[PDB]
């Protein structure tokens, strides 16, 4: 996963070409989940992606008030 976009000088595997993306998929069947999932509940192959999971729920709860408060 490092050299996949390193040899491509790319920051993210989704900016990696899908040819090389499927290349590691052939070896590694588990990578389907992060790569092939249309609406991943977590941003795949990131670090703070888990935090983004939290903060959006924060916003989701707030608007559930202001609109209901209004």
């Amino acid at each position: 996963l490092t050299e996949a976009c390193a040899a491509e000088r790319v920051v993210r595997p989704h900016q990696l070409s899908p040819a090389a993306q499927t290349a590691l998929l052939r070896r590694f069947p588990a990578l389907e989940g992060p790569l092939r999932h249309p609406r991943p509940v977590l941003q795949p192959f990131d670090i703070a992606a888990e935090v983004a999971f939290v903060a959006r729920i924060q916003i989701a709860c707030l608007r559930a008030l202001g609109h209901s408060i209004r």
Partner: protein
Amino acid sequence: RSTGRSALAVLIRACRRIQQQLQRTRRALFQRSNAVLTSLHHVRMLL
């Protein structure tokens, strides 16, 4: 004849096998040192 020719077999094995070691250190260190580069460009791959 057996004084030199068996003492000449000393260096004949010595100096050629010495320089054989260099090949491995070339094919070890620089195969290993490129892992550091993989990390550094992966450090940005975090961001």
